[PDB]
């Protein structure tokens, strides 16, 4: 069925599953033509496919060349997403294939269902949670690899860096969604918090700074303040 | 003109023949139906005064034999049976006509309603959907489930309709996933027309027979199948010109014939809005669209 607060813990059980987010697949900069009209110009995107338990991210980079000479791009984009997720499952060994795939936007349901007809035992599910995966492109290293790609390309990351050595998947997913939620609500301030102390660095094989346990508590706190703040500024409370 | 005599009418029952019906009282002297137009299939159907649960009925073609109705007090229904003794039948009928105990199939001559609803329906195909080959006629009722429905329980009592699913491998060519899902032309033209039904006439016949079981028996599955077949055509970008024009006619008379207070259950909002307003063929169903707007604008 659908995924929500009542069944939140299933994400971290031992049944393999993947989140698919399509928000960043088709990206445009809308501009003005010399004749005064408006045109879009595409830039590279990515499909954001994430195992919430292990932290493995399957970053499929969508190169602008895929849109060349096509129509109804916002619709095509959901079907390209679904083709590429299906190709990824097919590429995986049987014991690595997910038992469920949760799409973060309900519009991906039919496109994925149809590409996955060959996998009738994989449940395709929506969710009622308003997850912040759209902010994935606020992570510099993920943004950089997408904007630099010259061809279609799949890049693998662990979006939890080494956190699972010290915390549970549930805590690690909570930390990730809080960081992403802060980046989405005020990217500038959020990044300021993450790099305020020049002494804490990002390992070359990580995405996030190397905080101690005490420092992450302090970071997480500051991220919560920011999310509440922007909610006051937005709504005035 | 042919005749279906009735042994008796021991229980109070509303009796239909095609789109006509009349109330018969318990033990009223009623001995059958005469002047039934030859050349078409027909359906005789029943709804007991006491338990409106279970509309039931029989499809038949008078050309294929001599048929009669007799109440069975063990199974508790009006049963169709075939008489093999030819002169026994004529004699039974002639005596009944003489005593004028039979109603006349009351066809207005201006009226082609029945033909139009049954244009493509052939007893040969009905008997392949309703399997029971020791009889030349076909029993249908309110509660019978389809083979497709039984998938998702008793097969002898199934409506073996054509399995149709818009999210199946039969419908979607590997590597044309998006193409085939948003334009079902492949499914309609290659899989179903060329492959399964062979020509449009067989397709339309199943379509018409599904509508008729929906309307006459309120068979839910028949309504789902009828709706689905329509949807496979309206959602095809490429349909033979002759099918499109005929479809408008077919649907026109089904919508015309439907009881006005049964629209809530036998008609699916999504399908009709899509077919008439959003699909490829939104502009090819002029007659059907017109009659839907003047008669059921609430649905849209
Ligand atoms: C799949 O849902 C359904 C179930 C049963 C029938 C009729 O047997 C249907 O009409 C096609 C149907 O819609 C597809």
Coordinates of C-alpha atoms and ligand atoms in Angstrom, one line a residue:
Chain A
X1 CA 0.0 0.0 0.0
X2 CA 1.0 3.6 0.5
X3 CA 3.9 4.6 2.8
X4 CA 3.3 7.0 5.7
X5 CA 4.0 7.8 9.4
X6 CA 2.0 4.8 10.6
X7 CA 4.3 2.3 8.9
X8 CA 7.5 4.3 9.0
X9 CA 9.7 1.5 10.4
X10 CA 9.2 -0.9 7.5
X11 CA 11.9 1.1 5.7
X12 CA 14.6 -0.3 7.9
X13 CA 13.6 -4.0 8.0
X14 CA 15.5 -6.6 6.1
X15 CA 13.3 -6.5 2.9
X16 CA 15.3 -4.8 0.2
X17 CA 13.6 -1.6 -1.0
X18 CA 14.4 1.5 -2.9
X19 CA 13.1 5.1 -2.9
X20 CA 12.9 6.7 -6.4
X21 CA 12.7 10.5 -6.7
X22 CA 12.3 12.0 -10.2
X23 CA 12.2 15.8 -9.3
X24 CA 15.7 16.5 -10.7
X25 CA 15.4 14.3 -13.8
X26 CA 14.3 17.2 -16.2
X27 CA 15.8 20.5 -15.3
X28 CA 15.4 23.8 -17.3
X29 CA 16.5 27.4 -17.1
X30 CA 13.7 29.4 -18.6
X31 CA 14.9 32.4 -20.6
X32 CA 13.9 35.1 -23.1
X33 CA 14.4 34.8 -26.9
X34 CA 15.6 37.7 -28.9
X35 CA 12.1 38.1 -30.3
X36 CA 10.9 38.6 -26.6
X37 CA 9.3 35.1 -26.3
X38 CA 10.4 32.6 -23.7
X39 CA 12.4 29.4 -24.2
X40 CA 13.8 26.7 -21.9
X41 CA 17.3 25.4 -22.0
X42 CA 17.8 22.0 -20.3
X43 CA 20.7 21.1 -18.0
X44 CA 21.8 17.7 -16.9
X45 CA 19.6 15.9 -14.3
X46 CA 19.8 12.8 -12.2
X47 CA 17.4 10.1 -11.0
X48 CA 17.7 9.8 -7.1
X49 CA 17.4 6.0 -6.2
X50 CA 18.2 5.3 -2.6
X51 CA 18.2 2.3 -0.4
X52 CA 17.0 3.8 3.0
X53 CA 18.5 0.9 5.0
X54 CA 22.1 0.7 3.6
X55 CA 22.4 4.2 2.3
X56 CA 23.4 3.1 -1.2
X57 CA 22.5 5.8 -3.8
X58 CA 22.2 4.9 -7.4
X59 CA 22.7 8.3 -9.0
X60 CA 21.7 7.9 -12.7
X61 CA 22.8 11.0 -14.5
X62 CA 20.4 12.1 -17.2
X63 CA 22.3 13.9 -20.0
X64 CA 20.6 16.7 -21.9
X65 CA 21.2 14.8 -25.1
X66 CA 18.3 12.4 -24.1
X67 CA 15.8 15.2 -24.7
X68 CA 17.1 16.2 -28.1
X69 CA 14.1 16.3 -30.6
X70 CA 11.5 15.0 -28.2
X71 CA 8.1 16.4 -27.2
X72 CA 6.2 16.6 -23.9
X73 CA 9.4 16.5 -22.0
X74 CA 7.8 16.6 -18.5
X75 CA 5.9 13.5 -19.4
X76 CA 8.7 11.7 -21.2
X77 CA 10.8 12.3 -18.1
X78 CA 8.7 10.1 -15.9
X79 CA 8.9 7.3 -18.5
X80 CA 12.7 7.7 -18.9
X81 CA 13.0 7.6 -15.1
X82 CA 11.0 4.3 -15.2
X83 CA 13.0 2.8 -18.0
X84 CA 16.2 3.5 -16.1
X85 CA 15.0 2.2 -12.8
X86 CA 13.9 -1.0 -14.6
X87 CA 17.3 -1.3 -16.3
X88 CA 19.0 -0.9 -12.9
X89 CA 16.9 -3.7 -11.3
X90 CA 17.6 -5.9 -14.3
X91 CA 21.3 -5.2 -13.9
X92 CA 21.3 -6.3 -10.3
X93 CA 21.8 -9.9 -9.1
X94 CA 18.5 -11.6 -8.1
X95 CA 19.3 -11.5 -4.4
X96 CA 20.0 -7.8 -4.7
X97 CA 16.7 -6.9 -6.4
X98 CA 14.3 -4.9 -4.3
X99 CA 11.0 -6.3 -3.1
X100 CA 9.4 -2.9 -3.2
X101 CA 10.1 0.4 -4.9
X102 CA 8.6 3.5 -3.3
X103 CA 8.2 6.5 -5.7
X104 CA 8.1 9.9 -4.1
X105 CA 5.6 11.3 -6.6
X106 CA 2.4 9.4 -7.5
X107 CA 2.8 10.4 -11.1
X108 CA 5.6 7.8 -11.5
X109 CA 3.3 4.9 -10.5
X110 CA 2.0 3.9 -13.9
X111 CA 5.3 4.5 -15.8
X112 CA 7.2 2.3 -13.4
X113 CA 4.4 -0.3 -13.1
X114 CA 4.5 -0.7 -16.9
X115 CA 8.3 -0.9 -17.2
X116 CA 8.3 -3.5 -14.4
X117 CA 5.8 -5.9 -15.8
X118 CA 8.6 -8.4 -16.0
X119 CA 8.9 -8.2 -12.1
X120 CA 5.4 -8.9 -10.9
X121 CA 6.7 -9.7 -7.4
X122 CA 8.1 -6.2 -6.9
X123 CA 5.6 -4.0 -5.3
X124 CA 5.4 -0.4 -6.6
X125 CA 4.1 1.9 -3.9
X126 CA 3.5 5.6 -3.3
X127 CA 4.0 7.5 -0.1
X128 CA 2.1 10.2 1.8
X129 CA 5.3 11.7 3.3
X130 CA 6.6 15.0 1.8
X131 CA 10.2 13.9 1.6
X132 CA 13.0 16.4 0.7
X133 CA 14.9 14.4 -1.9
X134 CA 14.5 17.3 -4.4
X135 CA 17.3 19.1 -2.4
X136 CA 19.7 16.3 -3.4
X137 CA 21.3 18.8 -5.8
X138 CA 22.2 21.0 -2.9
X139 CA 24.9 18.4 -2.0
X140 CA 28.0 19.8 -3.8
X141 CA 29.6 16.5 -4.8
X142 CA 26.3 15.2 -6.3
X143 CA 25.6 18.5 -8.1
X144 CA 29.2 18.6 -9.5
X145 CA 29.2 15.1 -10.9
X146 CA 25.8 15.8 -12.7
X147 CA 26.8 19.2 -14.1
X148 CA 30.1 17.8 -15.4
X149 CA 28.8 14.6 -17.2
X150 CA 29.2 14.6 -20.9
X151 CA 27.3 11.3 -21.5
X152 CA 24.7 9.2 -19.6
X153 CA 26.5 7.8 -16.6
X154 CA 25.6 5.9 -13.3
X155 CA 27.6 7.0 -10.1
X156 CA 27.4 5.1 -6.8
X157 CA 27.5 6.8 -3.4
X158 CA 26.7 6.0 0.1
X159 CA 24.6 9.0 1.2
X160 CA 25.2 8.1 4.9
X161 CA 29.0 8.3 4.6
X162 CA 30.2 6.1 7.5
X163 CA 27.4 6.9 9.9
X164 CA 26.1 3.3 10.1
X165 CA 29.2 2.4 12.0
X166 CA 27.9 4.4 14.9
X167 CA 24.1 4.8 14.4
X168 CA 21.1 2.8 13.2
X169 CA 19.6 3.2 9.8
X170 CA 16.6 4.8 11.3
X171 CA 18.7 7.5 12.9
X172 CA 20.7 7.9 9.7
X173 CA 17.6 8.4 7.6
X174 CA 16.3 10.9 10.1
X175 CA 19.6 12.8 10.0
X176 CA 19.6 12.8 6.2
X177 CA 16.0 14.0 5.8
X178 CA 16.6 16.8 8.3
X179 CA 19.7 17.9 6.5
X180 CA 17.9 17.8 3.2
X181 CA 14.9 19.6 4.6
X182 CA 17.1 22.4 5.9
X183 CA 18.9 22.7 2.5
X184 CA 15.5 22.9 0.8
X185 CA 14.1 25.6 3.1
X186 CA 17.1 27.9 3.1
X187 CA 20.0 26.5 1.2
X188 CA 22.4 29.4 1.9
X189 CA 22.0 29.2 5.7
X190 CA 22.0 25.4 5.7
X191 CA 25.4 25.3 3.9
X192 CA 26.7 28.0 6.3
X193 CA 26.0 25.7 9.3
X194 CA 27.7 22.7 7.7
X195 CA 31.0 24.5 7.0
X196 CA 31.1 27.2 9.7
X197 CA 34.1 25.6 11.5
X198 CA 37.0 25.3 8.9
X199 CA 38.5 22.5 11.1
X200 CA 35.8 20.0 10.3
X201 CA 36.3 18.6 6.8
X202 CA 34.7 16.3 4.2
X203 CA 36.7 13.2 3.4
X204 CA 37.4 12.8 -0.2
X205 CA 35.2 9.6 -0.2
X206 CA 32.3 11.3 1.7
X207 CA 29.6 13.8 1.0
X208 CA 29.2 15.3 4.5
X209 CA 31.7 16.7 7.0
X210 CA 33.4 14.4 9.5
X211 CA 31.5 15.5 12.7
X212 CA 31.9 13.8 16.0
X213 CA 28.8 12.5 17.8
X214 CA 28.7 15.7 20.0
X215 CA 29.1 17.9 17.0
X216 CA 26.3 16.2 15.0
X217 CA 23.9 16.8 17.9
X218 CA 24.9 20.5 17.7
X219 CA 24.5 20.5 13.9
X220 CA 21.1 18.7 14.0
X221 CA 19.9 21.3 16.6
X222 CA 21.0 24.2 14.4
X223 CA 19.2 22.6 11.4
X224 CA 16.0 22.3 13.4
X225 CA 16.1 26.0 14.4
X226 CA 16.5 26.9 10.7
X227 CA 13.5 24.9 9.6
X228 CA 11.3 26.5 12.3
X229 CA 12.7 30.0 11.6
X230 CA 12.0 29.8 7.9
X231 CA 8.5 28.6 8.8
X232 CA 8.0 31.7 10.9
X233 CA 9.5 34.0 8.3
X234 CA 7.3 32.4 5.7
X235 CA 4.1 32.4 7.8
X236 CA 5.1 35.0 10.4
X237 CA 4.5 33.5 13.9
Chain B
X1 CA -42.5 -15.3 -36.7
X2 CA -41.7 -17.8 -33.9
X3 CA -43.0 -18.7 -30.5
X4 CA -41.7 -19.5 -27.0
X5 CA -44.6 -21.1 -25.1
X6 CA -44.7 -21.3 -21.3
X7 CA -46.0 -24.4 -19.5
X8 CA -47.5 -22.3 -16.7
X9 CA -46.7 -19.3 -14.5
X10 CA -46.9 -20.7 -10.9
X11 CA -45.1 -17.7 -9.3
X12 CA -45.4 -14.0 -9.7
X13 CA -42.7 -12.7 -11.8
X14 CA -41.7 -9.9 -14.1
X15 CA -40.9 -11.3 -17.5
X16 CA -38.8 -9.5 -20.1
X17 CA -38.3 -10.3 -23.8
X18 CA -35.5 -8.1 -25.3
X19 CA -36.3 -4.6 -24.1
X20 CA -39.9 -5.3 -23.2
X21 CA -41.4 -6.6 -20.0
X22 CA -44.7 -7.3 -18.3
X23 CA -45.9 -8.4 -14.9
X24 CA -47.5 -11.8 -14.5
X25 CA -49.4 -12.7 -11.4
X26 CA -49.1 -15.9 -9.4
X27 CA -51.0 -18.6 -11.4
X28 CA -52.2 -16.0 -13.9
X29 CA -53.0 -17.9 -17.1
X30 CA -49.9 -17.0 -19.2
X31 CA -48.6 -19.4 -21.8
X32 CA -45.9 -17.7 -23.7
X33 CA -44.7 -15.2 -26.2
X34 CA -45.5 -15.1 -29.9
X35 CA -44.5 -13.2 -33.1
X36 CA -40.9 -13.1 -32.0
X37 CA -38.9 -11.6 -35.0
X38 CA -36.7 -14.2 -36.7
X39 CA -33.2 -13.2 -37.7
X40 CA -31.9 -11.9 -34.4
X41 CA -30.8 -13.4 -31.1
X42 CA -33.2 -12.7 -28.3
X43 CA -33.2 -12.8 -24.5
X44 CA -36.0 -13.9 -22.1
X45 CA -35.4 -12.9 -18.6
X46 CA -37.0 -13.0 -15.2
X47 CA -37.2 -11.2 -11.8
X48 CA -39.4 -12.8 -9.2
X49 CA -41.8 -10.5 -7.3
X50 CA -40.7 -12.0 -4.0
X51 CA -36.9 -12.0 -4.2
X52 CA -35.6 -9.4 -6.7
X53 CA -32.2 -10.9 -5.9
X54 CA -31.1 -12.7 -9.1
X55 CA -32.3 -11.4 -12.4
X56 CA -31.7 -14.3 -14.7
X57 CA -32.5 -15.2 -18.3
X58 CA -31.8 -17.1 -21.5
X59 CA -30.2 -16.0 -24.8
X60 CA -31.6 -18.0 -27.8
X61 CA -32.1 -18.0 -31.5
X62 CA -35.4 -19.5 -32.7
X63 CA -33.7 -20.6 -35.9
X64 CA -31.7 -23.1 -33.9
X65 CA -34.6 -25.0 -32.4
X66 CA -38.0 -25.0 -30.7
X67 CA -37.7 -23.7 -27.1
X68 CA -40.1 -23.4 -24.2
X69 CA -40.2 -22.2 -20.6
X70 CA -41.3 -24.3 -17.6
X71 CA -41.1 -23.5 -13.9
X72 CA -39.0 -25.9 -11.8
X73 CA -40.3 -26.0 -8.3
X74 CA -37.2 -27.8 -7.0
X75 CA -34.6 -25.3 -8.3
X76 CA -37.1 -22.5 -8.1
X77 CA -36.7 -20.8 -11.5
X78 CA -38.2 -20.5 -14.9
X79 CA -36.1 -22.9 -17.0
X80 CA -35.7 -22.8 -20.8
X81 CA -35.9 -26.3 -22.4
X82 CA -35.7 -27.5 -26.0
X83 CA -38.5 -29.6 -27.5
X84 CA -37.2 -32.2 -30.0
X85 CA -40.7 -33.6 -31.0
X86 CA -41.6 -31.2 -33.8
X87 CA -45.4 -31.8 -34.0
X88 CA -45.8 -31.9 -30.2
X89 CA -44.5 -28.3 -30.3
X90 CA -46.6 -26.9 -33.1
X91 CA -49.7 -28.5 -31.5
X92 CA -48.9 -27.0 -28.1
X93 CA -48.4 -23.6 -29.7
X94 CA -51.5 -23.7 -31.9
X95 CA -53.7 -24.6 -29.0
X96 CA -52.3 -21.7 -27.0
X97 CA -52.6 -19.2 -29.7
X98 CA -56.2 -20.3 -30.3
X99 CA -57.1 -19.7 -26.7
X100 CA -55.2 -16.4 -27.0
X101 CA -53.1 -17.0 -23.8
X102 CA -49.9 -15.5 -25.3
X103 CA -48.5 -12.0 -25.5
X104 CA -47.2 -10.6 -28.8
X105 CA -43.6 -9.4 -29.1
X106 CA -44.7 -5.8 -29.5
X107 CA -42.4 -4.4 -32.2
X108 CA -43.3 -1.0 -33.5
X109 CA -42.4 -1.2 -37.2
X110 CA -40.5 2.1 -37.2
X111 CA -38.3 0.6 -34.5
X112 CA -34.9 -0.8 -35.2
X113 CA -33.8 -0.6 -31.6
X114 CA -33.3 -4.3 -31.1
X115 CA -31.4 -4.9 -34.3
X116 CA -29.1 -2.0 -33.6
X117 CA -28.3 -3.4 -30.1
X118 CA -27.7 -6.9 -31.5
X119 CA -26.3 -6.1 -34.9
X120 CA -23.1 -8.1 -34.4
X121 CA -24.2 -10.6 -31.8
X122 CA -24.3 -14.2 -32.9
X123 CA -25.5 -17.2 -30.9
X124 CA -22.3 -18.9 -32.0
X125 CA -20.2 -16.4 -30.1
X126 CA -22.6 -16.2 -27.1
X127 CA -22.1 -19.9 -26.6
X128 CA -18.4 -19.5 -26.5
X129 CA -18.6 -16.9 -23.8
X130 CA -21.3 -18.9 -21.9
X131 CA -20.1 -22.5 -22.0
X132 CA -22.7 -25.2 -21.7
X133 CA -23.0 -27.1 -24.9
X134 CA -25.7 -29.6 -24.1
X135 CA -28.1 -26.6 -24.6
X136 CA -28.6 -24.4 -27.7
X137 CA -29.5 -21.5 -25.5
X138 CA -27.5 -19.6 -22.8
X139 CA -28.2 -18.9 -19.2
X140 CA -27.0 -15.7 -17.7
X141 CA -27.6 -14.1 -14.3
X142 CA -26.9 -11.2 -12.0
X143 CA -24.2 -12.8 -10.0
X144 CA -22.1 -14.7 -12.6
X145 CA -18.4 -13.7 -12.5
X146 CA -16.1 -13.5 -15.5
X147 CA -13.0 -15.7 -16.2
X148 CA -10.8 -12.5 -15.7
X149 CA -12.6 -11.8 -12.3
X150 CA -12.2 -15.4 -11.2
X151 CA -8.4 -14.9 -11.7
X152 CA -8.0 -12.1 -9.2
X153 CA -14.7 -19.2 -8.3
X154 CA -16.8 -21.9 -10.1
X155 CA -15.8 -22.0 -13.8
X156 CA -18.9 -23.8 -15.2
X157 CA -20.8 -20.7 -14.2
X158 CA -18.3 -18.2 -15.7
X159 CA -18.6 -15.6 -18.4
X160 CA -15.6 -16.4 -20.5
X161 CA -15.1 -12.8 -21.7
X162 CA -11.9 -11.7 -23.6
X163 CA -9.3 -11.0 -20.9
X164 CA -8.3 -7.3 -21.3
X165 CA -5.7 -5.4 -19.1
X166 CA -4.0 -2.0 -19.9
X167 CA -1.1 -2.9 -17.7
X168 CA -0.1 -6.4 -19.0
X169 CA 2.6 -7.8 -21.3
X170 CA -0.1 -8.7 -23.8
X171 CA -0.9 -5.0 -24.1
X172 CA 2.7 -3.5 -24.0
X173 CA 5.5 -4.3 -26.4
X174 CA 8.9 -4.7 -24.7
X175 CA 10.7 -1.4 -25.4
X176 CA 7.6 0.4 -26.5
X177 CA 6.3 0.8 -23.0
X178 CA 5.4 4.5 -23.1
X179 CA 4.3 4.4 -26.8
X180 CA 1.9 1.5 -26.2
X181 CA 0.5 2.7 -22.9
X182 CA -0.5 6.2 -24.2
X183 CA -1.6 4.9 -27.6
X184 CA -3.2 1.5 -27.4
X185 CA -3.3 1.1 -31.2
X186 CA -1.0 -1.9 -31.1
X187 CA -3.2 -3.7 -28.6
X188 CA -6.4 -2.9 -30.4
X189 CA -5.3 -3.5 -34.0
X190 CA -2.6 -6.2 -33.9
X191 CA -3.3 -8.1 -30.6
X192 CA -7.1 -8.1 -30.5
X193 CA -8.6 -7.3 -33.9
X194 CA -6.0 -9.2 -36.1
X195 CA -5.0 -11.7 -33.4
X196 CA -8.0 -12.7 -31.2
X197 CA -11.2 -11.4 -32.7
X198 CA -10.1 -11.6 -36.4
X199 CA -12.4 -8.8 -37.6
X200 CA -14.2 -5.9 -36.0
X201 CA -17.6 -7.6 -36.2
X202 CA -16.6 -10.2 -33.6
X203 CA -15.2 -7.5 -31.4
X204 CA -18.3 -5.4 -31.6
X205 CA -20.4 -8.5 -31.0
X206 CA -18.7 -9.2 -27.7
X207 CA -19.0 -5.5 -26.8
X208 CA -22.7 -5.5 -27.5
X209 CA -23.4 -8.7 -25.6
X210 CA -21.5 -7.4 -22.6
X211 CA -23.6 -4.3 -22.6
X212 CA -26.8 -6.3 -22.7
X213 CA -25.9 -8.5 -19.8
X214 CA -25.0 -5.4 -17.8
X215 CA -28.3 -3.7 -18.6
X216 CA -30.6 -6.7 -18.4
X217 CA -29.1 -8.5 -15.4
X218 CA -27.0 -5.8 -13.8
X219 CA -24.0 -8.1 -14.2
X220 CA -21.1 -5.9 -12.8
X221 CA -18.3 -7.7 -14.7
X222 CA -20.3 -7.3 -18.0
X223 CA -20.3 -3.5 -17.3
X224 CA -16.5 -3.6 -16.6
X225 CA -15.9 -5.5 -19.9
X226 CA -18.2 -3.3 -21.9
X227 CA -16.5 -0.2 -20.5
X228 CA -13.0 -1.6 -21.1
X229 CA -13.6 -2.5 -24.8
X230 CA -14.8 1.0 -25.5
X231 CA -11.8 2.4 -23.7
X232 CA -9.4 0.3 -25.8
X233 CA -10.9 1.9 -28.9
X234 CA -11.1 5.5 -27.7
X235 CA -7.6 5.3 -26.4
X236 CA -6.2 4.1 -29.8
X237 CA -4.8 6.8 -32.0
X238 CA -5.2 4.6 -35.1
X239 CA -8.6 3.0 -35.7
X240 CA -10.1 1.9 -39.0
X241 CA -12.5 4.5 -40.3
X242 CA -15.4 2.0 -40.5
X243 CA -15.0 1.0 -36.9
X244 CA -15.1 4.6 -35.7
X245 CA -18.3 5.4 -37.5
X246 CA -20.0 2.2 -36.4
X247 CA -18.9 2.6 -32.8
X248 CA -20.8 5.9 -32.6
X249 CA -23.9 4.1 -33.8
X250 CA -23.5 1.2 -31.4
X251 CA -23.0 3.3 -28.3
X252 CA -25.7 5.7 -29.3
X253 CA -28.4 3.0 -29.1
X254 CA -27.0 1.5 -25.9
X255 CA -27.1 4.9 -24.2
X256 CA -30.6 5.5 -25.7
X257 CA -31.9 2.2 -24.4
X258 CA -30.6 2.4 -20.8
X259 CA -33.2 3.1 -18.1
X260 CA -32.8 6.7 -17.0
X261 CA -32.6 5.8 -13.3
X262 CA -30.0 3.1 -13.7
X263 CA -27.3 5.5 -15.0
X264 CA -25.7 5.6 -11.5
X265 CA -24.5 2.0 -11.5
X266 CA -24.1 0.9 -15.1
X267 CA -22.0 3.9 -16.3
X268 CA -18.3 4.6 -15.4
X269 CA -17.5 8.3 -15.1
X270 CA -13.8 8.0 -15.9
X271 CA -14.3 6.0 -19.1
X272 CA -17.0 8.3 -20.6
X273 CA -15.2 11.5 -19.8
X274 CA -12.0 10.1 -21.3
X275 CA -13.7 8.6 -24.3
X276 CA -15.7 11.7 -25.1
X277 CA -13.4 14.6 -24.1
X278 CA -9.8 13.6 -23.7
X279 CA -9.1 10.5 -25.9
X280 CA -7.8 10.4 -29.5
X281 CA -11.4 9.8 -30.7
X282 CA -12.9 12.7 -28.6
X283 CA -14.2 14.0 -31.9
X284 CA -15.4 10.8 -33.6
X285 CA -18.4 10.0 -31.4
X286 CA -20.8 12.9 -32.3
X287 CA -24.1 11.1 -31.9
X288 CA -23.0 9.3 -28.7
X289 CA -21.6 12.6 -27.3
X290 CA -24.8 14.5 -28.1
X291 CA -27.1 12.0 -26.5
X292 CA -24.9 11.7 -23.4
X293 CA -24.9 15.5 -22.8
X294 CA -28.7 16.0 -23.2
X295 CA -29.5 12.9 -21.1
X296 CA -26.7 12.4 -18.5
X297 CA -24.9 15.8 -18.2
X298 CA -24.7 15.2 -14.4
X299 CA -22.0 12.6 -15.0
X300 CA -19.8 15.0 -16.9
Ligands
LIG1 C1 -9.1 -5.9 -14.5 O1 -10.3 -5.5 -14.1 C2 -11.2 -6.1 -14.7 C3 -11.8 -7.3 -14.2 C4 -12.7 -8.0 -14.9 C5 -13.1 -7.5 -16.1 C6 -14.1 -8.3 -16.8 O2 -13.9 -9.6 -16.7 C7 -12.6 -6.3 -16.6 O3 -13.0 -5.9 -17.8 C8 -12.0 -5.9 -18.7 C9 -11.6 -5.7 -15.9 O4 -11.1 -4.5 -16.3 C10 -10.0 -4.7 -16.9

